[PDB]
């Protein structure tokens, strides 16, 4: 029979039945499953340091962002984008292709076709659950202990005065695997006193670090997460072949394959220079990158006044509403550029979510 996996070390965010205010630090903020009081109650240590108990039965206060740190894996599968084998964590199987699967990083990282609907297969014992397409689904940003985050020692700290003392601060340089069997479970920290080391952030449900300034850890399809209880659209090898004589490839760049960077610079080398929310800047062959977005916060844009097309564009991205009719042809301001490249636009006093093709720069 199917049974619940008490996956200590799971990286989680707030769930559908959440009613505990700002304990997590806000929606999308990440925490670590420390332990299970019972099959109905779980203890989470949020990246902001707040530790608390939550419901995981009947009511569900938590969603699983990443179970990979628990070491749970689907032997006999491979992610067809990054070639992780076995898939560790949640398994995502394309329902619309023959024998195609993604890992969590690649799935939330918009690999494969966004219009292809996937099965979620949370555990080896799980029955597969057909999802809506990513292209029509809401995407929010994860926040907490990620690259660029400002941290102090956490509750499970057992590493002497490597940080220079309790309360002394450092910067998360990179999220790493504490072990091969537990990916995405550690954070490498460069302390303000020049000391540096690797610390547990999820491994065996441990929390060695605590945010004083959380950082963005990429975006995810919230409603596709199971309850507890410029871009690069080319394969790595193609990128590698293209990067020869345009900056080359190193292993510090793996962020770029699933992370949206911003074109901060061009250069005389016929090449491009891109920064990422980690703080790193990287150089590329032009053919490696694809643009979107073409907009910036503050851009004035006119809403498309072809109703057929805006209906198509909005429905295609799961954002059509008849109440949008009076916005056609109106000029508005780009308030925010979402992670799925849709635009928060302020028009008619109100704000709406637009397919970027449904507006034109003034």
């Amino acid at each position: 029979s199917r049974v619940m996996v008490e996956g200590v070390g799971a990286r989680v965010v707030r769930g559908p039945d959440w009613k505990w205010g700002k304990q997590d630090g806000g929606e999308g903020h990440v925490g670590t499953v420390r332990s299970f009081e019972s099959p109905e109650e779980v203890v989470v240590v949020w990246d902001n340091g707040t530790a608390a108990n939550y419901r995981c039965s009947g009511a569900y206060d938590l969603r699983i962002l990443d179970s990979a740190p628990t070491g749970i894996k689907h032997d006999g599968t491979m992610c067809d984008t990054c070639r992780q084998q076995p898939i560790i964590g949640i398994r995502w199987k394309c329902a619309e292709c023959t024998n195609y699967d993604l890992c969590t990083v690649c799935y939330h990282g918009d690999k494969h076709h966004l219009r292809h609907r996937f099965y979620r297969i949370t555990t080896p014992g799980s029955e597969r659950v057909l999802l809506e397409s990513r292209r029509k689904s809401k995407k929010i940003t994860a926040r907490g202990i990620f690259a660029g985050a400002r941290v102090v020692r956490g509750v499970d700290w057992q590493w002497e005065d490597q940080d220079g003392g309790n309360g002394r601060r450092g910067k998360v340089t990179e999220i790493q695997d504490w072990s091969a069997s537990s990916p995405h479970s550690a954070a490498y920290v460069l302390w303000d006193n020049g000391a540096k080391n690797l610390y547990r952030v999820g491994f065996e449900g441990m929390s060695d670090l605590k945010c004083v300034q959380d950082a963005k850890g990429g975006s995810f399809y919230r409603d596709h997460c199971p309850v507890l209880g410029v871009n690069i659209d080319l394969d790595l090898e193609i990128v590698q072949s293209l990067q020869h004589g345009h900056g080359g490839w190193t292993d510090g760049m793996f962020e770029t394959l699933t992370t949206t960077g911003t074109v901060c610079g061009i250069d005389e080398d016929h090449d491009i220079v891109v920064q990422y929310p980690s703080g790193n800047r990287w150089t590329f062959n032009p053919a490696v990158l694809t643009k979107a977005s073409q907009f910036q916060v503050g851009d004035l844009v006119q809403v498309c006044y072809d109703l057929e097309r805006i209906k198509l564009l909005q429905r295609g991205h799961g954002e059509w509403a008849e109440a949008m009719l009076p916005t056609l042809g109106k000029v508005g301001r780009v308030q925010q550029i979402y992670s799925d490249s849709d635009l928060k636009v302020e028009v008619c006093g109100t704000s709406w979510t637009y397919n970027p093709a449904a507006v034109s720069k003034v």
Binding site: E41, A52, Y54
Partner: peptide, 6 residues
């Protein structure tokens, strides 16, 4: 550690 009613 916060203790929720639950």
């Amino acid at each position: 550690q916060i203790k929720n009613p639950i």
